[PDB]
A paper describes a structure:
In this paper we describe the first crystal structure of CNMT, an essential enzyme in the core pathway to BIAs, which introduces the amino methyl functionality that is often essential for the bioactivity of most of the medically important BIAs. Previous studies with CNMT from Coptis japonica showed that this S‐adenosyl‐l‐methionine (AdoMet) dependent enzyme can N‐methylate a number of natural THIQ, exhibiting highest activity with coclaurine 4 and heliamine 8.8 To further characterize this enzyme, the C. japonica CNMT was overproduced in E. coli. The CNMT structure reveals a typical class I methyltransferase α/β Rossmann fold forming the AdoMet‐binding domain, which is capped by a predominantly alpha helical BIA substrate recognition domain. CNMT forms a dimeric interface made up of 13 hydrogen bonds and 3 salt bridges, similar to that seen in the PavNMT structure.
CNMT consists of a relatively smaller, more compact, active site (CNMT 387 Å2/PavNMT 1081 Å2) which is shaped by positioning an extended loop (residues 249–260) and residues 64–82 of helix α4 closer to the substrate binding pocket. Three active site residues, E204, E207 and H208 are in close proximity to the methyl group of the product 8 a in the CNMT structure. Consequently, E204, E207, and H208 could potentially stabilize the substrate ammonium ion through H‐bonding or a salt bridge. Given that the E207 carboxyl is 7 Å from H208 imidazole, which is in turn 5 Å from the N atom of 8 a in the CNMT structure, H208 and E207 may function as a catalytic diad. Moreover, the backbone carbonyl group of T261 is within H‐bonding distance of H208, which could similarly assist H208 in functioning as a general base. The proximity of the residues Y328, W329, R330, G331, and F332 to 8 a also indicates these residues may be involved in substrate binding. The fact that F332 is closer to the product 8 a, in the CNMT structure, than W329, would also support this hypothesis. The CNMT structure indicates that larger substituents at C3 or C4 would clash with E204, E207, H208, and I234 residues of the CNMT active site.
Numbering used by the authors:
A (entry chain B): 11 to 357
B (entry chain A): 7 to 357
The structure:
């Protein structure tokens, strides 16, 4: 009700950044109050309830209404906001000199390091995005056989096209929905960068993925998380505007750092890392600098995409919201609440 | 320099029973505080990396070290002493106090019931009790699941003693007891439910131990585990520094590990976690406290017993204050910060 006018102000870009950030922190602080429990017994039971609950769901509900609101994004826009590698996920900022572009590379190298990728292997990039990791792995290891899987077509066409121009003869893009796709091939490395947040039955999904791992192969998983608790992105109450601010409810789950430790039926954990929230926070902060600095080019292309001025404005302030959501959320408490998690699995 | 010698004087005062209970609790809390400080990390990244350093280093060890010198200093205790210090079932592990007026006996019973609930024992099952102690669980499960066939495993000639005798004395078919080093025991038998109550703390290489135990699980069988823990970090029970007198006060060096509550989540190569609970440190705190009350109230019968077992009053004194420090260590460690630091973890595994 009284949030209906806040959402409207945010749409019209009336609320300045300082004010936005503080209103967001208020919402985060309320989420921590909600998520943290007085006794560790309860805290653990809340993870046990969510794990058991997801085990009676389908691999992912509402699969490509997610992929037409987001992910079917103009390439030309993502080239403005994202870095050169078009990484649509956490980047890694070692030092403060670290630009967005280096931060992209740093994170991608770390993946290859931590997934233990060697020149002649089959490599599978599930939820490939704009192909940042696929192209990286292809340029880096000439004899690797990379297969990037997406359900989008704007993504598929770009990666295919980009391979050709970068002259990467070892990339293969496969258009499919992973929730229902079955493939009889098998791979030495499987890589999943921030896909699981959109899915539900991690048991069925990891059972499905476990079979695409050849013997002695490995599955590498990045997911954002909270340090301690886990939850569906669903409003706390009548006053929570932040949860559905950017992601439409039902599209998102925020795992605990330990979450997929509870899903080791068909894969077994080998290694586990986490990584400060300040990394994704700066990533978002550089995505935001990128919008605001290129408004002059963004407005006219938004203005033609939405044949309209009623709405070119709402879409630009949507993307600010995205950025400021990630900036403050993962930034919260010097990066020690919401953060990223890296898990390495064998069969 | 003199702080090394200050410590050794403290240790002998404790052996001689010259330090009042409150002074002991105060000093223990100071070490505890310092372990928390050494344990917690300023970034979560460093915290998780610490768990990985330990999970990985254990995988290169053997299943257990100091095995028979653990069965000698501890776990070969005269039963006559245990019936005084422990409650009716001689449970030498965490009991469950739901209400402020829960007795020790009641509390033993409540934990034992909770094990059967969480391991989902059912009247027609084959049950293996690894590291059975004085068989508090074996006898309990045996009793009113008459068509179970409980099997207890111990490397302690004194523990095989008491169970076999007290199991025919209560007119029980089911109970069978085997004397074996679990570190080296192989067996071609196979069980619907394997219960492990506070055994792993003495082990090292958990990947090798759990590989072995899973081979003893029947199809659709379960593994139920209890281990004490700290909620966040894990560690070998080795001294922080030279001023740490508490870490080796009770348990011999290199015989104990304190896992994180999350620890065995990382040892799932041959088993698979189905459920996971923790349980407030107030239960084991209160348990150790009820044990301590039972000592002091029966010094009249414990003193001659310890004289008879030792050869001289000097060592009988040292021994009774040993057991006091056992229970005091337990009280303060697990009751620390209202029981939300050191505590008990329950894990249910399938094959
Ligand atoms: N059900 C599904 N089937 C196939 N691909 C999916 C999918 N759901 C989401 N995706 C893809 O997975 C990606 C998750 S966002 C991650 C982007 C990319 N992995 C990167 O690192 O930059 C989206 O870009 C989308 O293309
Ligand atoms: N290496 C080893 N092999 C077999 N048993 C061992 C062992 N190390 C310790 N134990 C046994 O494991 C138990 C740990 S104390 C727990 C006692 C019992 N489970 C109870 O709850 O009452 C003791 O009985 C000890 O004798
Ligand atoms: C900006 O906030 C978020 C950004 C992203 C994610 C989650 C965010 O906040 C929870 C998920 N990744 C899959 C895509 C990027
Ligand atoms: C009293 O402190 C402890 C008691 C016991 C344990 C650990 C204790 O302190 C860490 C372990 N169980 C195996 C045996 C009982």
């Amino acid at each position: 009700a009284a949030i209906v006018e806040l959402l409207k102000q945010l749409e019209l870009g009336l609320v300045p950044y300082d004010d936005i950030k503080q209103l967001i922190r208020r919402e985060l602080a309320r989420r921590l109050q909600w998520g943290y429990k007085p006794t560790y017994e309860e805290q653990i039971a809340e993870i046990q309830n969510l794990t058991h609950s997801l085990r009676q769901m389908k691999i992912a509900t509402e699969v490509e209404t997610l992929d037409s609101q987001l992910y079917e994004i103009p390439i030309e826009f993502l080239k403005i906001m994202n870095g050169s590698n078009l990484k649509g996920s956490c980047c890694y900022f070692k030092e403060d000199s670290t630009t967005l572009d280096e931060a992209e590379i740093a994170m991608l190298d770390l993946y290859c390091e931590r997934a233990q990728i060697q020149d002649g292997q089959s490599v599978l990039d599930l939820g490939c995005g704009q192909g940042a990791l696929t192209l990286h792995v292809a340029q880096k290891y000439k004899n690797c056989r990379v297969t990037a899987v997406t359900n989008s077509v704007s993504q598929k066409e770009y990666i295919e096209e980009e391979s050709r121009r970068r002259n990467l003869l070892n990339v293969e893009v496969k258009l499919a929905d992973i929730t229902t796709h079955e493939m009889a091939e098998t791979y030495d490395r499987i890589l999943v960068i921030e896909l699981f947040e959109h899915m539900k039955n991690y048991e069925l999904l990891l059972r499905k993925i476990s079979e695409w791992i050849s013997k002695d192969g490995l599955l590498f998983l990045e997911h954002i998380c909270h340090k301690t608790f886990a939850y569906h992105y669903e409003p706390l109450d009548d006053d929570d505007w932040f949860t559905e601010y950017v992601f439409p409810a039902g599209t998102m789950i925020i795992p605990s750092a330990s979450f997929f430790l509870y899903f080791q039926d068909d894969v077994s954990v080998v290694n586990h890392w986490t990584l400060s929230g300040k990394h994704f926070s700066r990533t978002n902060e550089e995505w935001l600098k990128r919008l605001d600095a290129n408004l002059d080019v963004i407005k006219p292309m938004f203005e033609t995409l939405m044949g309209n001025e009623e709405e070119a404005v709402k879409l630009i302030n949507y993307w600010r919201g995205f950025c400021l959501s990630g900036m403050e959320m993962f930034g919260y408490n010097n990066g020690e609440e919401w953060m990223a998690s890296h898990v390495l699995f064998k069969k």
